[PDB]
Amino acid sequence: KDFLPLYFGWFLTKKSSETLRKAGQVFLEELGNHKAFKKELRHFISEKLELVSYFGKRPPGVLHCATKFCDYGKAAGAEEYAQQEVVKRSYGKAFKLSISALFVTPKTAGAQVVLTDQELQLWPSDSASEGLPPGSRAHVTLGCAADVQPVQTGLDLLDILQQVKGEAVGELPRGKLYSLGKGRWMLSLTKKMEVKAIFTGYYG
Numbered sequence: 443k444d445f446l447p448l449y450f451g452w453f454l455t456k457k458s459s460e461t462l463r464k465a466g467q468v469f470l471e472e473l474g475n476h477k478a479f480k481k482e483l484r485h486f487i488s489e490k491l492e493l494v495s496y497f498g499k500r501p502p503g504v505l506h507c508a509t510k511f512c513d514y515g516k517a518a519g520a521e522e523y524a525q526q527e528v529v530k531r532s533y534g535k536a537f538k539l540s541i542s543a544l545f546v547t548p549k550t551a552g553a554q555v556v557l558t559d560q561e562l563q564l565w566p567s568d569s570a571s572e573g574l575p576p577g578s579r580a581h582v583t584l585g586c587a588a589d590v591q592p593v594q595t596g597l598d599l600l601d602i603l604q605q606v607k608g609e610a611v612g613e614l615p616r617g618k619l620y621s622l623g624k625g626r627w628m629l630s631l632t633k634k635m636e637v638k639a640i641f642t643g644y645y646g
């Protein structure tokens with residue numbers, strides 16, 4: 443047949459990618475320098491940690507929010523995903539993604555995406571997902587620790603939302619900082635950030 447992409451997703455514009463990337467960097471700088479984070483460094487790893495370097499594996503270019511990992515058809519449900527009318531119809535079209543929070547764990551750094559009803563139509567329907575609304579996994583990856591694979595980022599977000607399912611420990615310029623234990627951190631943005639993106643397929 444025609445082989446599918448490596449994955450489908452929304453790919454941020456240059457502009458939006460810059461803006462979100464910087465926001466992520468600033469968050470990492472602020473968080474690592476924050477008194478509340480320094481107290482819990484023993485629950486984060488095994489003197490201050492520079493989190494921008496810790497998350498050394500970062501997206502090189504434009505950022506994205508993946509929908510369905512297809513691995514060129516080899517992944518289960520890949521064909522069944524690509525054949526959908528709403529996918530074929532939305533291919534190449536513009537969307538705005540809403541960023542609700544930035545998060546950090548011992549494994550990944552990322553941004554939480556809250557999909558619109560329309561965008562959720564593009565979310566795949568193939569135990570981490572249990573109990574949470576559809577599309578909760580939706581994220582943009584900002585960084586990964588050396589031996590992590592950024593499939594981890596989605597799992598990390600889901601685990602975090604399973605927790606949030608109390609009171610702020612800190613105040614950052616962009617919002618409230620929450621300490622969720624086990625080295626997990628969440629910045630809830632006072633103002634949700636809007637990024638512009640195009641739905642398409644990555645081949646690489």
Ligand SMILES: Nc1ncnc2c1ncn2[C@@H]1O[C@H](CO)[C@@H](O)[C@H]1OP(=O)(O)O
Nearest residue numbers: 449506507508511581583592593595596
């Ligand atoms: N098993 C998987 N399930 C869903 N998405 C995956 C995946 N493995 C890789 N991906 C996504 O596809 C890319 C493969 O190069 C990764 O960057 C990852 O994007 P992500 O960072 O947004 O999660």
